């Protein structure tokens, strides 16, 4: 198949494995008309003759969308695609009706998976969502070798060895080998996407708690690839892998992006034979301080074995963590494995997951050695090197069915509405520019006066054991058991002195405050929170809510150490401050001209503040009837400030599953759309021209035509004469009549 690299999804000057709905044999015959079982097709024309193709069902269904293609040739190919319901070629309900102009000799085609229809236009791919497209399993072909047409009927699960050189495709060789590749192996696409149509055979969604079983939602998941390493050859001699796929052996399949990832994902191989599934071996992690060893055994007596089961078991396996500090062989049970082990995922953050489920959490991992003792290569299908992305996922029986990355404006609309494909028409949009803002602070006059507090903890371990508990923790408030604020302003820190040991074995312990029993979070007491009075204590105080102090050894065991107690009463004598402001006599902050978070005379919100000057006689706060600041006057002077919400909403016109244009309040280019018009009360942004036949979408006195340009609406033309009078005159009196039937519907 003389495909382009773009169609294949391969890098230049290289050698890769391509899997999926590929073309193979070419039906170079003059049989005119034929029908095949198919999941798609490719064809090549150059000759000046019509050709046509259709994907359909084995019977006529009035409500099935059918796919019809026609090609006509002149200088270029005029290619028409219609996806519609038909009256037993009369269409009456269409998803798409498009014309493309293509290079002669190009291989063009269609492939279907589930309800996803992919249109291959040589240089580009366009995707549509078509209800029950998977039913369209019959292919009709109208095409002869006599007129240059050749085609390949697409079946399924093809694996091809591809070689590229100097922009050309050199080799296209179908494997007789590559058994099972089509379920596990693919090429990394540009920007790290997983190819549409891939079956996520052993790819789990990661969780921290509950799992999804069936439905559609936006997830944050490690599904963008920087590398992908097939049948990697990992052996006990391999050594440690440092997350970034820059190892000497990592011959990634497809595109490679030389950066640093969030996780490594191990897609494990196994069979039905338990004796080919249980392997001796360990997983070792290099943390910032110590090696950590993970391993399992069949009985609870972990000391008797050191294994990793892959695939299905027939008995429980107990898994433990070992780590040693100067012969202090700390060892703990962690948990029981699932009946079947399919995927292991390790984060740089230290989080370790099996089949999506989090088992333990190390402080940090520099590198991993998946130390399976073996005889073969056949323990792994692939190692993936990935980062987190915002994706829309169709989940079924916990598995990924449809993965949509939302990077482009249209994909983002699909995400925003949680819907795999939209309905042509108008949609509201406001793609909030989520980010970190600077904070402004405006308040009535007051002298600045601030005190520091730290809630500190110092700890010792190894009293009789580790994992069980801390030996002792010393808790204090600036060294006291009680500290109060007697100042206008204050701020509070939390400090865990692992450093007291001089040699932080204590880095294996995590000690921190839990959410308390208080109507505030401890860590947020440094925002501009206001009290009449507070007082803090390290000892029990009647009536005082508290924040428990908890300890863990790598998030396996949990125990309470102590608590911070706090009292308070509401009012406005004491204000929390984000940091220890100094020098300043009277504290305030004001940032202008891009988004901020603000607290202004107790109005709290976000937006953009700009200076102005109007004769605003009266008070200093101006609000909407919804209670939102419109502006404020700066007390000591007459300067006024205007407050606006930077994330403005707009209206988007959608047609043929794409963005056509948009109506906005802001004089700027937008969703790829460049051509900006000014209209009496808005701007319209398009990419269309000024010559576009007819509206396809309408409102008011204008319509949006097929290419997005605007067309004025004109009232229906109609007229007649008046009633003739009793006057000597030349009258016009109807002689010949016809008839028409007018249709009216009334609900009863």
């Amino acid at each position: 198949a003389n495909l382009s690299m773009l169609q294949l999804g391969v890098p230049d000057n290289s050698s890769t494995i391509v899997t999926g709905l590929l073309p193979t044999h070419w039906f170079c015959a003059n049989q005119s008309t034929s029908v095949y079982s198919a999941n798609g097709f490719f064809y090549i024309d150059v000759g000046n003759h019509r050709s046509a193709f259709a994907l359909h069902t084995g019977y006529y269904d009035a409500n099935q969308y059918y796919i019809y293609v026609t090609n006509e040739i002149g200088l270029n190919a005029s290619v028409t695609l219609k996806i519609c319901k038909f009256s037993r070629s009369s269409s009456f309900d269409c998803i798409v009706n498009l014309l493309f102009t293509e290079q002669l000799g190009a291989p063009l085609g269609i492939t279907i998976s589930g309800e996803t229809v992919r249109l291959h236009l040589y240089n580009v791919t366009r995707t549509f969502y078509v209800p029950a497209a998977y039913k369209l399993t019959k292919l009709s072909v109208k095409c002869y070798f006599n007129y240059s047409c050749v085609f390949s009927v697409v079946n399924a699960t093809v694996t091809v060895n591809v070689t590229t050189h100097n922009g050309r495709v050199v080799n296209y060789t179908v494997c007789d080998d590559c058994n099972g590749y089509t379920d596990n192996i693919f090429s990394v696409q540009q920007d790290g996407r997983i190819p549409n149509g891939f079956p996520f055979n052993n790819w789990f969604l990661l969780t921290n708690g509950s799992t999804l079983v069936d439905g559609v939602s936006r997830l944050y998941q490690p599904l963008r690839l920087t590398c992908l390493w097939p049948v990697p050859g990992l052996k006990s001699s391999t050594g440690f892998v440092y997350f970034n796929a820059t190892g000497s052996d990592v011959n990634c399949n497809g595109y490679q992006h030389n950066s640093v990832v969030d996780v490594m994902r191990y897609n494990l191989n196994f069979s039905a034979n338990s004796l080919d599934n249980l392997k001796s071996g360990v997983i070792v992690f290099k943390t910032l301080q110590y090696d950590v060893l993970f391993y399992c055994s069949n009985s609870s007596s972990g000391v008797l074995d050191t294994t990793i089961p892959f695939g299905p078991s027939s008995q429980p396996y107990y898994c433990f963590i070992n780590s040693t500090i100067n012969t202090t062989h700390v060892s703990t049970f962690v948990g029981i494995l699932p009946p079947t082990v399919r995927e292991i995922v390790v984060a740089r953050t230290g989080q370790f997951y099996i089949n999506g489920f989090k088992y333990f959490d190390l402080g940090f991992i520099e590198a991993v050695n998946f130390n399976v003792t073996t005889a073969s290569a056949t323990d792994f299908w692939t190692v993936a090197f990935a980062t987190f992305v915002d994706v829309l996922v169709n989940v079924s029986a916990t598995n990924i069915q449809n993965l949509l990355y939302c990077d482009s404006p249209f994909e983002k609309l699909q995400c925003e509405h949680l819907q795999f494909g939209l309905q042509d028409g108008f949609y509201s949009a406001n793609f909030l520019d989520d980010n970190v803002l600077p904070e402004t602070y405006v308040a009535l006059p007051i002298y600045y006066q601030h005190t520091d507090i730290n809630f500190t903890a110092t700890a010792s371990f190894g009293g009789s054991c580790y994992v069980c508990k801390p030996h002792q923790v010393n808790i204090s408030l600036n060294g006291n058991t009680s500290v109060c604020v007697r100042t206008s302003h204050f701020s509070i820190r939390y400090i865990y002195n692992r450093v007291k040991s001089g040699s932080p074995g204590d880095s294996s312990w995590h000690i921190y405050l839990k959410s308390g029993t208080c109507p505030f979070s401890f860590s947020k007491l440094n925002n501009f929170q206001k009290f009449k009075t507070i007082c803090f204590s390290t000892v029990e105080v009647p009536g005082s809510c508290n924040f428990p102090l908890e300890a863990t050894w790598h998030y396996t065991s949990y125990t309470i150490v102590g608590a911070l107690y706090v009292t308070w009463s509401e009012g406005n004598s004491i204000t929390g401050v984000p940091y220890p402001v100094s020098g300043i006599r009277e504290f305030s902050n004001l940032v202008l001209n891009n988004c901020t978070k603000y607290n202004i005379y107790d109005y709290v919100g976000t937006g953009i503040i700009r200076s102005s000057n109007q004769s605003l006689a009266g008070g200093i706060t101006y609000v909407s009837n919804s209670g939102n600041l419109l502006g404020f006057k700066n007390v000591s002077t007459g300067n006024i400030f205007i407050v606006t919400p930077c994330n403005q909403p707009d209206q988007v016109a959608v047609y043929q599953q794409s963005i056509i244009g948009a109506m906005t309040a802001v004089n700027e280019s937008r969703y790829g759309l460049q051509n900006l018009l000014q209209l009496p009360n808005f701007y319209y942004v398009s990419n269309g021209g000024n010559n576009c036949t007819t509206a396809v979408m309408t409102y008011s006195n204008f319509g949006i035509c097929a290419d997005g340009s605007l067309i004025p609406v004109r009232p229906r033309n109609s007229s007649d004469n008046g009633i003739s009078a009793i006057i000597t005159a030349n009258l016009s009196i109807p002689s010949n009549w016809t008839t028409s039937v007018q249709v009216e519907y009334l609900q009863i």
């Binding site: 509405h417 909030l432 700009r610 419109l630 919400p645 009232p715 109609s718 008046g722 009258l731």
Partner: protein, 342 residues
């Protein structure tokens, strides 16, 4: 008609807050429905009004005041031109009606500079007030076509007749006239001219004053209601529900997500309920207006184009003809009738 309103599912609940963008996912099937209802209604209304506002260039041209002569019509006729690329403008009466009782320019709501006006202040809450359908040029084209029909009598070509003749025909309809000389016409033209002046004066500031007052009261009422509905919707944003604040940001500045999400969910529930209520109100208003449009069309056909015999319908007297002009969200009909004196 009435103005279409479209309200953003999210902006009116959590005004640009990325935390709600996640929390609201669980209400997609209940939140999207708000937009579906509002958008559909706007669509249906636009189509319906568009189907009325037709145009005839012959009658439009013949609507010239010189076709009417002794009877005047100058305060009724659209301004022929405003030296601009526009087919027509509002008549003197229309300028009066609109000015006395009184679409948002959204381009201003991004500049800062001034304390915001009310419109932008509503825009900032995701409440958009859309452009109208019955715009001034359409209404003038429609109206002018109706008026020219008064003089475009049933002749060859598009020849017109004197309005005096047109009226004579409309008299013969009622009772065949047996007098060659039209003694009646000068009396009626003069009387008509006074009536029209009285009406315009009555609107600016005879039992016509009763009838005009009623029209004004009704026009004002329609306007007030549209404003009131939006103010209510907007005001409800301040109705802190059972939560710490009414500002989502203020909640997230104080509480971690484990509690903040609950406080915010209470606010979300409340705000979604407010939107559901609003939508119901809107739909009911559309139903009322549809009733009124049906009637209006009947009057256009029977009392403008034809001339009925439906005593008690268009005008409490002997109906000769009616004039139609635009008014805020509607039509104003001026029914010219005869009243016996002696």
């Amino acid at each position: 008609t009435s103005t279409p309103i479209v309200v953003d599912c999210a902006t009116y609940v959590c005004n640009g807050n990325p935390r709600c963008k996640n929390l609201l996912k669980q209400y997609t099937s209940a939140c999207k429905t708000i937009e579906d209802a509002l958008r559909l209604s706007a669509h249906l209304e636009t189509n319906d009004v568009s189907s009325m506002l037709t145009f005839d260039s012959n009658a439009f041209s013949l609507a010239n005041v010189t076709s009417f002569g002794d009877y005047n019509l100058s305060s009724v006729l659209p301004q022929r031109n405003i030296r601009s690329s526009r087919i027509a403008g509002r008549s003197a009466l229309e300028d009066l009606l609109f000015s006395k009782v009184v679409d948002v320019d959204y381009k201003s709501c991004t500049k800062g500079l001034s304390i915001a006006d009310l419109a932008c202040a509503q825009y900032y809450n995701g409440i958009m007030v859309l452009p109208g359908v019955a715009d001034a040029e359409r209404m003038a084209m429609y109206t002018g076509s109706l008026i020219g029909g008064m003089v475009l009598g049933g002749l060859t070509s598009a020849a017109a007749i004197p309005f005096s003749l047109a009226l004579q025909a409309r008299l013969n309809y009622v009772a065949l006239q047996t007098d060659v000389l039209q003694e009646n016409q000068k009396i009626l033209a003069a009387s008509f001219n006074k009536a029209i002046n009285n009406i315009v004066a009555s609107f600016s500031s005879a039992e016509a004053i009763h009838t005009v007052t009623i029209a004004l009261n009704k026009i004002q009422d329609v306007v007030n209601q549209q404003g009131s509905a939006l103010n209510h919707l907007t005001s409800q944003l301040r109705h802190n529900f059972q939560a710490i604040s009414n500002s989502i940001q203020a909640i997230y500045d104080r509480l971690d997500s484990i509690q903040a999400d609950q406080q915010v969910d209470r606010l979300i529930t409340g705000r979604l309920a407010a939107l559901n209520a609003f939508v119901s109100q809107v739909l009911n208003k559309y139903t009322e207006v549809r009733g009124s449009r049906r009637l209006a069309q009947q009057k256009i056909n029977e009392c403008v184009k034809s001339q009925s015999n439906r005593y008690g319908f268009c005008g409490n007297g002997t109906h000769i003809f009616s004039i139609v002009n635009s008014a805020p969200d509607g039509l104003l009909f001026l029914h010219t009738v005869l009243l016996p004196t002696d």
